[model samples]
Target: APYWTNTEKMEKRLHAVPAANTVKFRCPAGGNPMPTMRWLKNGKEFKQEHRIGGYKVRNQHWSLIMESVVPSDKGNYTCVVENEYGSINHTYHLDVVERSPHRPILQAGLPANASTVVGGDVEFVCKVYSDAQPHIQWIKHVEKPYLKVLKAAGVNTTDKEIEVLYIRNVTFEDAGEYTCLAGNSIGISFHSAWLTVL
Candidate 1:
């Protein structure tokens, strides 16, 4: 009986960053009569475009190459290989994570430099703007104490533009220069402000 050769297993799930120039899916199969391979998307067979490179089968290997992969390119894909005696099938879940080229921009807030009475509550809000969505960190300007203090603060974050740090019952120790840093895979940016408590 002819059987499809199991070699070069396809990934069950594929992930890539957005704006990728090219991505290729390969399904290699072999049998006594040489199995034929077909590609399908969302249960429907589709042909490649002029600029797109693949969906070509050569020497018992089939490949589909997507050019300039975008969000729309993500979907369920299936590969079918069959011959006279048996057939093999595989499906892949394609996921494209967002990749941002933009750098973070911090928004100016009122009381650029804040002053508060000791034992009063103070809050520093930093608004960062970017398509890539940056991770936020708040650190005191002073070295040595900065990491330990920032770690104690347990910085706040959300999926939006604003990130916050709270100083409850402000003390002289809390009075210093603080920075709000934003970052993504592309780059990092920051804003600074001073807190004075008397």
Candidate 2:
């Protein structure tokens, strides 16, 4: 005779979920009495017609992930939890704001349409007006021409708002699209110029 076996299911207690973009509020490891979960925004249960990616993991941890967290999402968010033994929870204060990338402007050190002798160098700089620090990346649109490998030039997280690119020993191969990309926490923008080889 064949018999079906059954086992009691365990309920998780004290859980948390975080957004893919968010790097915080993770689920606790090794838990028991699987927790019950609820969501609140500004001390009120958050209800929505269309739910994005935010969710509750194991009924303990809860998170509201706004992929494009708009301005309307700004509020005090709280995660409430409870268990058969007792109760616990977590909370996050979210403030969705707009951030703008730095705009880099190009200015010629030498006069316009100037001719440079062979084997000379040109200095290209990116200028931007922004409250936060900016970054500039130079690129030559072609295969195996990525300029980011330079350990000297790189993006900065703090205390830097400037980037510069130097071209030495001018060559016909260097003639292509040269772009300067500026960015910050908000986003990024780019400007490009063409170099003609004679």
- Candidate 2 regions off by >4 Å? 1-115, 144-163
Q: Candidate 2 on 43-101: residue-level lDDT in tens?
A: 76666643465543433333334453455555556655556665555456655445443
lDDT of 1 at 30: 62
Clashing pairs in model 1?
none
lDDT of 1 at 28: 66
lDDT for each residue of candidate 1 in 23-135, tens digit (9 for 90 to 100): 66767666677777777777777656622544344443555566566666677778777888888777776777674477776675622677777777667676657676566
Q: Give me the candidate number with maximum lDDT.
A: 1
- Work out candidate 2's RMSD over C-alphas: 12.6
> Would you give me the overall lDDT of model 2?
0.48
Task: Give each model a TM-score.
Answer: 0.56, 0.35
Once model 2 is optimally superposed onto the true structure by TM-score, how far is the C-alpha of residue 173 displaced, in angstroms?
A: 2.3
In order, candidate lDDTs are 0.64, 0.48
Colliding pairs, model 2: 11-34, 12-34, 12-35, 13-34, 13-35, 15-60, 15-61, 16-61
